[PDB]
Design a protein around this ligand. Sequence first.
Ligand SMILES: *[C@@H]1O[C@H](CO[C@H]2O[C@@H](C)[C@@H](O)[C@@H](O)[C@@H]2O)[C@@H](O[C@@H]2O[C@H](CO)[C@@H](O)[C@H](O)[C@H]2NC(C)=O)[C@H](O)[C@H]1NC(C)=O
Ligand SMILES: *[C@@H]1O[C@H](CO[C@H]2O[C@@H](C)[C@@H](O)[C@@H](O)[C@@H]2O)[C@@H](O[C@@H]2O[C@H](CO)[C@@H](O)[C@H](O)[C@H]2NC(C)=O)[C@H](O)[C@H]1NC(C)=O
Ligand SMILES: *[C@H]1O[C@H](CO[C@H]2O[C@@H](C)[C@@H](O)[C@@H](O)[C@@H]2O)[C@@H](O[C@@H]2O[C@H](CO)[C@@H](O)[C@H](O)[C@H]2NC(C)=O)[C@H](O)[C@H]1NC(C)=O
Ligand SMILES: *[C@H]1O[C@H](CO[C@H]2O[C@@H](C)[C@@H](O)[C@@H](O)[C@@H]2O)[C@@H](O[C@@H]2O[C@H](CO)[C@@H](O)[C@H](O)[C@H]2NC(C)=O)[C@H](O)[C@H]1NC(C)=O
Ligand code: NAG
Ligand code: NAG
Ligand code: NAG
Ligand code: NAG
Ligand code: NAG
Ligand code: NAG
Ligand code: NAG
Ligand code: CA
Ligand code: CA
Ligand code: CA
Ligand code: CL
Ligand code: CL
Ligand code: CL
Ligand code: CL
Ligand code: CL
Ligand code: K
Ligand code: MG
Ligand code: NA
Ligand code: NA
Ligand code: NA
Ligand code: NA
Ligand code: NA
Lengths: 351, 175, 527
Amino acid sequence: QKNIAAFGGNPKSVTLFGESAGAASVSLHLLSPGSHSLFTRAILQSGSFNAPWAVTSLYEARNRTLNLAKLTGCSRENETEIIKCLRNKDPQEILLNEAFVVPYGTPLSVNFGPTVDGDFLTDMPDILLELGQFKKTQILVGVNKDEGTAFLVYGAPGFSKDNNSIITRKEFQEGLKIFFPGVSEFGKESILFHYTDWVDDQRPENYREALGDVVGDYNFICPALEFTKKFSEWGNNAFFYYFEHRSSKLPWPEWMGVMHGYEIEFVFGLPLERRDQYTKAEEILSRSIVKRWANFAKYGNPQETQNQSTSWPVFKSTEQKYLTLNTESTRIMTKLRAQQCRFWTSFFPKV
Amino acid sequence: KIFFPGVSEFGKESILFHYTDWVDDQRPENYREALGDVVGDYNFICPALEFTKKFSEWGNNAFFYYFEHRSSKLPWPEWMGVMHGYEIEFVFGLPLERRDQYTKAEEILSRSIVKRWANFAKYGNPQETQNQSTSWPVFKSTEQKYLTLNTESTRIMTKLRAQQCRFWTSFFPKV
Amino acid sequence: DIIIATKNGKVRGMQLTVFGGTVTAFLGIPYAQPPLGRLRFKKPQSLTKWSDIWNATKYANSCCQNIDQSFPGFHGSEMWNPNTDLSEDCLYLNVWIPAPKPKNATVLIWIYGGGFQTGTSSLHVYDGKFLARVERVIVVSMNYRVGALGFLALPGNPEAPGNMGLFDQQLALQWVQKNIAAFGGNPKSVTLFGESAGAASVSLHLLSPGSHSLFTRAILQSGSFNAPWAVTSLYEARNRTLNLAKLTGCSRENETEIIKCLRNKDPQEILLNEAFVVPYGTPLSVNFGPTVDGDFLTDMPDILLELGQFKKTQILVGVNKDEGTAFLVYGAPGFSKDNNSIITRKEFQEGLKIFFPGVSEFGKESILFHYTDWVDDQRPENYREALGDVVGDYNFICPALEFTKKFSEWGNNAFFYYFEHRSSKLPWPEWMGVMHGYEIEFVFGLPLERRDQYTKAEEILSRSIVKRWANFAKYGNPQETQNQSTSWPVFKSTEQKYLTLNTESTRIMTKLRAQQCRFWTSFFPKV
Ligand SMILES: *[C@@H]1O[C@H](CO[C@H]2O[C@@H](C)[C@@H](O)[C@@H](O)[C@@H]2O)[C@@H](O[C@@H]2O[C@H](CO)[C@@H](O)[C@H](O)[C@H]2NC(C)=O)[C@H](O)[C@H]1NC(C)=O
Ligand SMILES: *[C@@H]1O[C@H](CO[C@H]2O[C@@H](C)[C@@H](O)[C@@H](O)[C@@H]2O)[C@@H](O[C@@H]2O[C@H](CO)[C@@H](O)[C@H](O)[C@H]2NC(C)=O)[C@H](O)[C@H]1NC(C)=O
Ligand SMILES: *[C@H]1O[C@H](CO[C@H]2O[C@@H](C)[C@@H](O)[C@@H](O)[C@@H]2O)[C@@H](O[C@@H]2O[C@H](CO)[C@@H](O)[C@H](O)[C@H]2NC(C)=O)[C@H](O)[C@H]1NC(C)=O
Ligand SMILES: *[C@H]1O[C@H](CO[C@H]2O[C@@H](C)[C@@H](O)[C@@H](O)[C@@H]2O)[C@@H](O[C@@H]2O[C@H](CO)[C@@H](O)[C@H](O)[C@H]2NC(C)=O)[C@H](O)[C@H]1NC(C)=O
Ligand SMILES: *[C@@H]1O[C@H](CO)[C@@H](O)[C@H](O)[C@H]1NC(C)=O
Ligand SMILES: *[C@@H]1O[C@H](CO)[C@@H](O)[C@H](O)[C@H]1NC(C)=O
Ligand SMILES: *[C@@H]1O[C@H](CO)[C@@H](O)[C@H](O)[C@H]1NC(C)=O
Ligand SMILES: *[C@@H]1O[C@H](CO)[C@@H](O)[C@H](O)[C@H]1NC(C)=O
Ligand SMILES: *[C@@H]1O[C@H](CO)[C@@H](O)[C@H](O)[C@H]1NC(C)=O
Ligand SMILES: *[C@@H]1O[C@H](CO)[C@@H](O)[C@H](O)[C@H]1NC(C)=O
Ligand SMILES: *[C@@H]1O[C@H](CO)[C@@H](O)[C@H](O)[C@H]1NC(C)=O
Ligand SMILES: [Ca+2]
Ligand SMILES: [Ca+2]
Ligand SMILES: [Ca+2]
Ligand SMILES: [Cl-]
Ligand SMILES: [Cl-]
Ligand SMILES: [Cl-]
Ligand SMILES: [Cl-]
Ligand SMILES: [Cl-]
Ligand SMILES: [K+]
Ligand SMILES: [Mg+2]
Ligand code: NA
Ligand code: NA
Ligand code: NA
Ligand code: NA
Ligand code: NA
């Protein structure tokens, strides 16, 4: 705000964009009254603060601060004395102990993250979202087709980047234990139930695909769609995309599909670099995404107006139109993961 | 186990789960009341409400009532409340018989139900038009208005057992 | 040790433990010159400034008032009596703030009832510490003058212009605009709330142009200014000021000479005579209350309501299931807190005489007629229940519903509740049901105190009401969003949806007391 005019920029036309925790951050700036006047609009790539990894409760937070003290020989009496001790520790001694403040972590553990501090965040963010207490502006929100797969190779039994990861029923069950460690037996059976009614050939990859869907729907896609619904109910324009292109250069194996984080290079326009070995179709998809992001930032409308492109409709409650981003045919579709999200959003929270 | 013998372990836990989140005093009758609700919702009330929704979606007028008066003469004990089958005597007008030991309020409730059933039969509209009565609204998808039948205050209400019926009607059949 | 710098100087507070946490309480901060001597009966004058640290560590003097002596030793009446010294030196206010000091907290300002004749901010059931702890709001409450000391009127004469206690309230709201940021509060997010005459006061601030910029929204618990006890006409007002003079040996010639005489009287001599300025009073008499003064209130409030001349904002409005019963034991024949109060037809008739003394014979028969068409068993309590319904519908429920309709017709969101839970601890007997004033303890979160012998279901109902009031104040929408709760719909003309508050099943219902209110609102006024 203070300096960008000197570089030829317009402080009145600032768009935030971010991916994963970076997207959850963009979403919290839409909520924080101290950020309201520092930006114009927002773009959220695979993340939002209502994802179940994004915000730590006060209770877990103090428990984690105190466990960190026990581990560093910093358990004290005066709280300000705990911190003063902690300031004397070598940064390495703090990093080494971070993983252990939690009794069981998952590959998506966020040990130290946003909290309701009464300053940045004045109330529980789900309450602010629901009651319309956020900056009124346009948003662009999206997710990748295979969000969940990247995490399976960081602890799910029977998975591996170096084979096809065909797993059994029993391995799937063990995998729900790895990803949902605090959850009751019934809570875990209910997941198995929703995701294993096969249609239907006895395909060997049934369980492998189901486990990636479980992880992506719960952690990324359903919270993104739900954030988008509630936000657009207060009258602002929203645009939703489903990214479904697997990079020709992806070094992870094929079963992992269109992974978490692998739209970013298209957004930054790396395939525009011809001397770089992306394909021609990839250059053109990146060039269209670049123009759409740029139009959204400048004009609040992510259209590509010159090349007979598919027109991107606004996302509303009720119709829930979204746009697919791929190398062949750009399509408008409706009600992404409708059945799955009813499960995660209206049933599972009760569990 | 007695009421859902063919049902999986998970199917049965899901019932326990929906019906035992207590609100909340540790009341000793919690489980007794929950088990009667389970049996009535699954077997009678949710299928009735669901039949009424689907039928009225094709354009016809429907009227829905919730009967909540316990007969002063009921020989079953009190914990059983407003039992299955014990509206019938009000519909047939037995309490109209004064020499029969129903109360005055019961004679009047039966007399109003008799007139409503009769008007529905003759005129297709179950109103009691002469005695400043509550007007019975048609039941539609979306609003789901229904009328309560009782001895004190006749009321229009909406969305009977909404949460319970979402369970029986959209989840449980999958089990 | 907690010291805050105000515009008028430093104040010191004290810390309280509440549910394993801390709240900081500043009790007894002055907000005006003591209105003594030549200032008796005048508008509150602004306060000078102190050098040194003002100690705000105990409740202050309550204002001069007659006391309820109908049931000595009985906690049901006596919990409403003042619990600090009575004095004309009573213009003080209280502040409860969360600890650690909040950054920009919403502010809730409580205005007590008592008929404009009684009441005090220091009562136990108005202690703001529970709301500050649980909801992280700041809670403010003030004392304001009541009785003749607060509402004597010779309209247009600044020695006794009328509405002085409403001006006392107004000046405390200004104190909050100027000072609350120093305590971590947001002057841009202030909600008024009040019960009974306190609610009627909140409603008059929605009408008074001098209050428009001192608050954001309003909550009205069992009261509004269109209730028939809430506003005195100019005619009754002068008659009452002059009768008061006859009684004190102050009848004079020059009006300013009447007031000067009255300023020499002992406060007791004024209190003693207050009951007699009226030829026949009822248990709901308001001898000295709001008037159309041309200053606070620029026209008859029913005219302002009807023509849309009020602050545009959200409101939350509600009533209790048995508003009328508390008043029956203060003069209705055959009633008693110590028996079941089964009364006859003839006692009911005598009771209408006690409650509607200026009303014609036909006016009284019309009431009997609307409320005694029995349905139908010859139940012995028919007449007892009918008389409480009469008193509650006329005085509280129908004026509240009517205020809510007219207000929401000008485009603002309104929420209406019907409170139907009888406290497990109620010391009044059962036939009195869900009495007037006995939601207040749920709103202030007293049952959150486990060591206090309310039930578990009561803790949970209070916790949900607390969250709803807090959300309304912060966000203008009284939802409880986390616990699968019933969603509270806005009240509109036409549908008239309202929410029930009870321990079992929270319900949305429509058209509360439709038939009764047609009677009170469209027929009875003609009588
Ligand atoms: C895919 O590989 C996994 C991962 O573990 C292995 O990596 C392989 C490429 C292989 O070279 C192997 O030596 C290495 O350990 C296999 O899962 C393992 O299966 C064994 C049974 O031998 C289990 O006891 C192991 O605990 C399990 N390891 C882990 C870390 O879970 C997996 O079976 C294989 N799948 C195929 C080929 O379909
Ligand atoms: C309920 O009590 C009233 C109130 O008056 C009485 O309080 C009682 C508890 C009792 O001890 C009695 O001594 C005391 O006076 C009764 O009303 C009274 O009824 C009498 C007839 O005896 C009338 O002449 C009185 O004027 C009347 N008193 C008042 C102040 O109105 C009432 O009858 C009783 N009702 C019951 C038991 O159902
Ligand atoms: C927060 O509090 C305790 C902390 O216990 C932890 O001690 C830390 C220093 C760290 O090393 C961590 O791994 C360890 O768990 C949690 O209680 C644990 O759970 C077990 C259950 O078997 C208990 O026996 C112990 O109290 C403790 N474990 C061990 C091995 O000492 C507690 O669960 C946690 N609260 C949460 C997650 O809500
Ligand atoms: C206002 O004016 C007179 C005031 O009369 C009153 O004198 C006061 C000092 C006080 O003690 C009060 O009790 C007394 O009533 C009212 O007229 C009264 O009504 C009677 C009817 O029987 C008349 O005979 C008298 O003028 C007077 N009564 C007595 C006993 O002296 C008048 O009604 C009132 N106006 C209103 C209420 O609108
Ligand atoms: C603890 O010590 C700090 C810093 O040394 C001091 O300022 C504070 O007053 C003390 N607090 C408590 C709670 O003992
Ligand atoms: C539009 O088409 C031209 C060629 O016809 C091409 O060079 C370019 O990549 C396209 N522009 C955008 C923004 O997609
Ligand atoms: C209507 O009211 C009359 C008396 O006023 C009564 O006798 C009768 O029971 C009522 N009729 C019906 C149909 O309810
Ligand atoms: C206010 O409170 C403290 C007591 O803790 C005292 O030191 C101070 O002087 C008091 N002021 C008075 C009594 O005026
Ligand atoms: C508090 O919030 C308001 C808006 O409701 C804002 O204008 C104000 O300046 C804020 N003050 C702070 C954080 O001190
Ligand atoms: C009466 O006396 C007052 C005050 O002493 C004086 O100012 C005023 O002019 C007089 N008014 C009338 C109407 O006689
Ligand atoms: C919500 O539910 C929790 C327990 O599940 C309970 O402790 C609390 O009283 C509730 N919160 C509100 C605001 O009602
Ligand atoms: Ca976490
Ligand atoms: Ca006390
Ligand atoms: Ca009056
Ligand atoms: Cl199994
Ligand atoms: Cl569709
Ligand atoms: Cl509804
Ligand atoms: Cl008669
Ligand atoms: Cl209706
Ligand atoms: K389920
Ligand atoms: Mg009171
Ligand atoms: Na990772
Ligand atoms: Na890459
Ligand atoms: Na029978
Ligand atoms: Na009273
Ligand atoms: Na009480």
